[PDB]
């Protein structure tokens, strides 16, 4: 018994994705996925029948130390992301290829540089950013994968693979842009942003991509409700990028919690206190969550084209009381958000805090693999609930 109200004047081809970019590192620690009925199926497969038709990977450089143990998060690289993107395709959904440029999690505070580009001059960490994307395209391609869209960097507020200078930050965008190009017309170039509720931060962004004459085609933006501002703004905002500079405008990264319980044994990151919970820790309100992006990016119009929900699927690899057990398991497949290997790479963080999953409570499956009914929320949206 879910109830969804129509999303209205959502368009017949909106993107209805997921990032699903640890269920590898998860198949390989045992974790299993089923269906409405009970029974053990691809998650794929799962993800089709409910209505997704994109999926978005998260890719590495070298998210391993000099031995080959994983960084943790999923250990994505390019090799996984074929491997998912191959599933993918032979499940009728596009691809969204999300380059981090780093060798592990790249976000506003963290966008250190792949450990090969670690000390080479700006010029040559350029050719090199454009020499990996048009790689890794190619080898995609090879693998007959459907690639729609291509990310050129994950929440980079402030830097991107070790740059800091917005000057030279656009250089490496276009670097990794042009190989998008030189491989196919058809592929959409978007560039990844997060804190939407900062005043006047989107706009100042989008106008100094245009002052260095960056080429991308999608402005996409992360959606938190717990820490971005409500969807008034984050409508607003986008609206703006979209009407003043021509941009199709998107959300690439959402979530919310259905159970205020971590059933991982690794703390969860929501929800707590000072986060702002606008909707009932429940599968109902987790759904209406969901719902709700989709009709703030859908009320901006023809520039918005989807919306993209956050690791659904990284549930727990065993029950919150085997602590000890799992410990093992995400420190062998990295399936947990970071293994201690990675204190190499980020001492401050994931040295310190590596563990299992922090969003088991923000998936559209429980503890168990099962799906919730949450799921059909993709449908839903078009329709509504009789
Ligand atoms: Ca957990």
């Not at 007959?144 to 490496?172: F, P, R």
């Not at 978007?190 to 106008?207: D, K, Q």
């Not at 690439?252 to 986060?275: C, I, L, R, V």
């Not at 999953?357 to 839903?380: E, I, T």
């Amino acid at each position: 018994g879910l109830y969804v109200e129509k999303v209205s004047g959502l368009r017949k081809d909106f993107i209805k994705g997921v990032d699903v970019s640890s269920i590898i590192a998860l198949e390989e620690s045992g974790v299993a996925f089923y269906n409405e009925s009970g029974k053990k199926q691809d998650i794929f497969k799962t993800l089709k029948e409910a209505g997704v038709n994109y999926v978005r990977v998260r890719i590495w450089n070298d998210p391993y130390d000099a031995n080959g143990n994983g960084y943790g998060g999923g250990n994505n690289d390019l090799e996984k992301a074929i491997q998912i993107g191959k599933r993918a395709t032979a499940n009728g959904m596009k691809l969204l290829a999300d380059f981090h440029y780093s060798d592990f999690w790249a976000d506003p505070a963290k966008q250190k540089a792949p450990k090969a580009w670690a000390n080479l001059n700006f010029e040559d960490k350029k050719t090199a950013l454009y020499q990996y994307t048009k790689q890794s395209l190619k080898a995609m391609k090879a693998a007959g994968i459907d690639i729609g869209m291509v990310q050129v960097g994950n929440e980079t507020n402030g830097g991107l693979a070790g740059e800091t200078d917005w000057a030279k930050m656009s250089q490496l965008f276009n670097a990794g842009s042009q190989a998008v190009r030189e491989t196919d017309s058809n592929i959409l170039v978007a560039l990844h942003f997060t804190n939407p509720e900062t005043s006047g931060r989107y706009a100042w962004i989008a106008e100094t991509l245009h002052r260095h004459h960056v080429d991308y085609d999608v402005f996409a933006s992360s959606y938190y409700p717990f820490w971005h501002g409500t969807l008034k703004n984050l409508t607003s905002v986008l609206t703006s990028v979209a009407d003043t500079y021509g941009k199709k405008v998107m959300v690439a990264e959402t979530s919310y919690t259905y159970t205020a319980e971590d059933g991982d044994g690794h703390g969860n990151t929501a929800p707590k206190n000072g986060q702002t919970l606008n909707n009932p820790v429940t599968v109902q309100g987790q759904a209406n969550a969901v719902r709700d992006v989709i009709q703030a990016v859908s009320d901006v119009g023809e520039a918005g084209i989807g919306v993209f929900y956050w690791e659904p699927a990284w549930i727990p690899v065993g029950p919150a009381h085997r602590l000890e057990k799992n410990k093992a398991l995400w420190e062998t497949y990295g399936s947990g958000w970071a293994t201690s290997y990675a204190a190499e790479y980020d001492p401050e963080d994931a040295g310190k805090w590596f563990g299992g999953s922090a969003v088991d409570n923000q998936a559209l499956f429980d503890f168990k693999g099962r799906p919730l009914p949450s799921l059909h929320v993709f449908q839903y949206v078009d329709t509504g609930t009789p």
